[PDB]
Amino acid sequence: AMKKENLKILAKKAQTIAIVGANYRFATRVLLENLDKMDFTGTIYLVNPRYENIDGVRCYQSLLEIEDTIDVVVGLVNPQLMIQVASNASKINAKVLVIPGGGYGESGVEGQNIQNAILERAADSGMRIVGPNCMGYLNMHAQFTPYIGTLHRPLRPIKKGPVSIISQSGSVNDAFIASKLGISKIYSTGNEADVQMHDYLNLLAEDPETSVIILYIEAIRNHLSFLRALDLCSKNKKPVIAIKVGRTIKSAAVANAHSGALAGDYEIEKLFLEGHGVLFVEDIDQAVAVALLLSQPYLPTVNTVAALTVSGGQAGILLDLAEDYGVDFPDFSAVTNYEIASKLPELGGLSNPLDIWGKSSKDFSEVSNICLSSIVKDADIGIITVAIDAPIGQGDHEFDFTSIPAKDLASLRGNSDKPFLYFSHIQTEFDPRVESILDEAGIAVIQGSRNALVACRALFKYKEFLEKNNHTPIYSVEDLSIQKGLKLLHDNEGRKLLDESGFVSPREQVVTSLQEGVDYAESIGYPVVLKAQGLAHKTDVGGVALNIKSAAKLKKAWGKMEHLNSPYYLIQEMVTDGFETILAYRTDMNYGPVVIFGLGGIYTELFNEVVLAVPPITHKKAEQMVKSIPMLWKSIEGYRGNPALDLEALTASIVQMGETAMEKYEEIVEFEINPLSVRVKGVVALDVLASVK
Amino acid sequence: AMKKENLKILAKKAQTIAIVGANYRFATRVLLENLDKMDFTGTIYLVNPRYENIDGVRCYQSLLEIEDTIDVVVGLVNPQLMIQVASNASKINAKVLVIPGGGYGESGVEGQNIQNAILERAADSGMRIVGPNCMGYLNMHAQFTPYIGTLHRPLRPIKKGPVSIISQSGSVNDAFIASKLGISKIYSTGNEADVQMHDYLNLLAEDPETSVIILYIEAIRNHLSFLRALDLCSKNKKPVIAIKVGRTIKSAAVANAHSGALAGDYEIEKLFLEGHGVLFVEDIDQAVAVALLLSQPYLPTVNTVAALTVSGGQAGILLDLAEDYGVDFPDFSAVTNYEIASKLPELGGLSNPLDIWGKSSKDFSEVSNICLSSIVKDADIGIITVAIDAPIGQGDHEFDFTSIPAKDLASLRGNSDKPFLYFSHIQTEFDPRVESILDEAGIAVIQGSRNALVACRALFKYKEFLEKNNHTPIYSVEDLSIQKGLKLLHDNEGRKLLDESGFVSPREQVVTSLQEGVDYAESIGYPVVLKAQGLAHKTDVGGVALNIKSAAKLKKAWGKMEHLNSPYYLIQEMVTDGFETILAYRTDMNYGPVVIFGLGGIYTELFNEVVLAVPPITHKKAEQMVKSIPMLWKSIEGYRGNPALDLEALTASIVQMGETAMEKYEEIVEFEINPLSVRVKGVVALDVLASVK
Ligand SMILES: Nc1ncnc2c1ncn2[C@@H]1O[C@H](COP(=O)(O)OP(=O)(O)OP(=O)(O)O)[C@@H](O)[C@H]1O
Ligand SMILES: Nc1ncnc2c1ncn2[C@@H]1O[C@H](COP(=O)(O)OP(=O)(O)OP(=O)(O)O)[C@@H](O)[C@H]1O
């Protein structure tokens, strides 16, 4: 017996709970109130040597006094007192001690020590510690709510359901709770002194009561276990949604490569976690919207949406937003628009979103049923939606007509596999009478165009991830140095790496003295290129003489570069013309190698346009990377009467950068080709730069 | 007392309303309920030849039998019969006939005839027509609701306030009515057969019961009149907020110059409308949020925001969002930091947003009061916000807690001039107990961070419009050529403009035969040219040579250009290096000249980076335009060792383009320089394009 068995109770039905420090203050009162109103069937014990009884319930003098097996202890005494609570809870083999209060490892040195002593006393029996400094947790299916916050809400009650949430915030849970989400479990993680996000996530992965997971992430502590927890989730086919706080936080660290400034730590992490299936959103509203749509067991087979409205204006605005969010509302198929213009010749030209109100003499009922019957079967439409404002408090007349397409959606639900969604353009709360109808038929309901669009976008991304089947590999970071400094590699070594990886370098050689430079240059032709050496950025200090015709200009350009006390110089051909890109990889401290590719050259950081990819990179993927940058791609096709460049050579070079990255990331943490010149034939590595540490 | 005086009743108290075609159906019933429930104090008359009474209220057989002065008629009978109603209503000098039924000017040509027949019979007495084909209108301050739609909402009434709305979309009004806006008047424009948007807007401009205006725009019809109404609103210091549909719609109209593609009609219109004070937003939620904040009589003096929260995670998400929306949250002043350090040193270093929860042993009530009292007086902070989720149904303890900063805001409201706002991070419904505290104190309340940020940004924009007090002139499009076919100007006339406008081309001369060219070329020296004339877009068809180093290479090039049968050939000196910009103007069929400026060259449309300005352009305006394009601006300063370019000449160029546009817009509808080369000294137009007719 040990910590592993005890962990399991967090996702299960507890038979008994003891509340230590039970008194007349909010934590106790709300604990008892929650267990009452949420219909806990187990036994509650109160422990406090200061009181005879509370609410008529006996207050025990000690956990040791209780004649029963205790599953879960919630400790409410002060931090100093809590050490002995842990010790007594351990003595009786409590499976879990929940410590909602703060003033621990997250409050300073003294409190870190208290926290350590607690862990040490729990280690004895393997009792788990939840928190400290958190709201606790709740389990709607077990009716067990060791949770410090008011759960009972006559007005807007919590609804039980398939969505579970792990949150590193002790302040956003009521926000999730106040949403329309059907909740199963919510874990507030706190200091994660013992039970961490990956632990809760492992539980959720295999919890039959959860089909959808939401994470609210402030900071991942144990990257490897987290990644493995994510993998357990996809293994179990449970979508995982995340909000990650600190998205725009600089990260001030090292970097010799332009790649450093072009790929933020955040975007690197995002790319890796998406590789493992994470569906990122930006805020709670969006998390909710995505989860509400994913809570229905329907997925799209094609990345397109139909919207049926009763407003021209709103249809117009939705269409504009669809472009902003990159959601495809395509024309209806030729069968569909014939099927409709055949029974409703009075609608005319069909747009998507499609306004179907006041366009016919027929009952709106009939117009609606016709359109949705056809649109539902349309092979070019992945998701079927109705976009209609049906605000709370609307009149009966307004209900009669807004409920009509809901009823239709409900009537077609049993005979389609397509995701259905009724959403309102506006954010305001839905009329419950319309929601009742879609809730009864298992149709998703979302408030707000932007959220519905994010939701749809997220469905698609989820579908793609299921299709990949071959997800992102976990890279070991064990060999990686912990030093926080960077050492620039000698240009020689740089060149050696280009070679060994098959990258083509311009004909070049390193000269020691001026005559040698003239002698070498006069043995290759002009123009050549003269570059100072030992620098990360040569151009800035005038260490790059280009287009130097004749040995006359050569000796002069060398004359102007003497102040840069340059050890050896390098001369190369003047690689004529070719589109400038940047191709590199960096070593992420937690995740491993990542490849960076995009608009390159001296102005690379000003273009600020790249794409990332975790190796290995498939040939298909490299091609998609190229085509995903307009100015890059349109240039390869040959822009405005210009020769088409060597796509296939560029593609291969990207793949190759991927394999080198996999090979050398633990030792070389920066490897960059700026610019990698793309030409009619071949691609040329004009420059190279590598860093270590 | 024709048209003019009758129109004013739309904004005032009506004593009598006659409903023609009254029956037991929804339109009559909802009208009567609306007037009952909004407390209409005037007299209602029912008119219908079929009924002797309706629910025992006398039903007159004819308008003509009512022995009272009738102010407003609502016609509910079918279009055909409506002509007879119009004749009757005009005969008794009714001020307004409201037609919300459909089947008129928008239905068919038949409907069109009925409509003009109705206008015909109204002109007899100057009777105004609302609609047809709309829901009517509502004026909360006169308790008058000739409105076809349920306004009665016993549990969440429409609240009377200072915001008024003109919408070209019926189906949208109830979206607004369901919002938290304090409403004055709402006008639904319908077919705008007689009374149009600008008409409603003029009423609102001088309506003392309106202090904030929202427009939901589908298509401006009378541009001059619209602009003038805008200017009346401006004169009366009433902010105008607008949603304008069609933001993403194509318009491949006009256009020989790249400007056509860089500055689409929608962006052009937007710039002009903003010049007249319009505050654009993207959707209904945003319009609501902006109007809520403007409904309080406080404007900021510096363009910054402070936010106080009880969540570190939501603080963090708010910060991230503030970056996306471009809203400044600066550190607090030295005075604020010092002061709070002196009182709550345990808080440590203050960040903004400031999480004030669980940082102190002090009562939250004391912490909150100290922090807000200090932050309200902080000269570096323009807008004071509390950002706290307080959703409906939250517990008694959660209310007690989330209401604390609301009461503090309420208490400090009296002695600050700064805008105050309490917003939730999430979109969902506020706890009405918290909202009430803010409502009673005249403090803005918004739901959702995005809305909050858009509102703050709009406040800054409005305050800036107020400061310039030197607005966009109205340009006449009177003598503006009314053709639709765009004719390219010959390169001949192009270069003439350059000179007349003071632009300076490269050394250049026109030539006809190769010899004439090889001569001239040798006369000015190489490298040079070569460019075909009378063509596109020459470079697309290989009509531009470049870098021709000898008489040999010239003839080579001149021979490749053979097959494009050019009548003329332009020879110019090869203008060395320097930054490529595009500088132009275009004539907008409705608004007049606009200047386009940005990243130029062959890749101009791919860059898609320009800024627009309506002339006259001040020298300082031109500066901003330049510094607003990072790539351009950084190079002007001198990027990475490269020398600084001539800002003054660039700046002066843009001023000049604005002047040329003012002079020549009614004849030359496109004048474009691509590229305008920015050099170390001076600027040089390498190319020219123009169009007329
Ligand atoms: N062999 C070459 N042929 C033609 N052009 C070259 C050649 N080498 C360098 N250049 C040009 O000089 C520019 C800068 O060269 P290089 O990258 O070596 O210097 P740098 O200061 O180290 O640049 P960075 O650090 O921005 O990558 C290149 O972007 C390219 O335009
Ligand atoms: N006199 C010159 N000196 C140096 N470069 C030049 C000169 N004239 C043109 N160019 C180069 O050739 C490019 C195209 O020339 P130009 O604008 O005259 O033809 P174009 O096809 O009409 O271009 P566009 O349609 O984009 O305006 C310019 O953007 C510039 O880079």
Numbering used by the authors:
A (entry chain B), B (entry chain A): 35 to 727
Give the text the authors published on this PDB structure.
Genetic and biochemical work showed that Psychrobacter sp. D2 possesses a novel DMSP lyase termed DddX for DMSP catabolism. DddX is an ATP-dependent DMSP lyase which catalyzes a two-step reaction: the ligation of DMSP and CoA, and the cleavage of DMSP-CoA to produce DMS and acryloyl-CoA. Sequence analysis suggests that DddX is an acetate-CoA ligase, which belongs to the acyl-CoA synthetase (ACD) superfamily and requires CoA and ATP as co-substrates for catalysis. Diverse DMSP lyases in some algae, bacteria, and fungi cleave DMSP to yield gaseous dimethyl sulfide (DMS), an infochemical with important roles in atmospheric chemistry.
To elucidate the structural basis of DddX catalysis, we solved the crystal structure of DddX in complex with ATP by the single-wavelength anomalous dispersion method using a selenomethionine derivative (Se-derivative). Although there are four DddX monomers arranged as a tetramer in an asymmetric unit, gel filtration analysis indicated that DddX maintains a dimer in solution. The overall structure of DddX is similar to that of NDP-forming acetyl-CoA synthetase ACD1, with a root mean square deviation (RMSD) between these two structures of 4.6 Å over 581 Cα atoms. ACD1 consists of separate α- and β-subunits, which corresponds to the CoA-binding domain and the ATP-grasp domain of DddX, respectively. Sequence alignment indicated that His292 of DddX is likely the conserved histidine residue to be phosphorylated, and Gly280-Tyr300 is likely the ‘swinging loop’. In the crystal structure of DddX, His292 from loop Gly280-Tyr300 directly forms a hydrogen bond with the γ-phosphate of ATP, suggesting a potential for phosphorylation, which is further supported by mutational analysis.
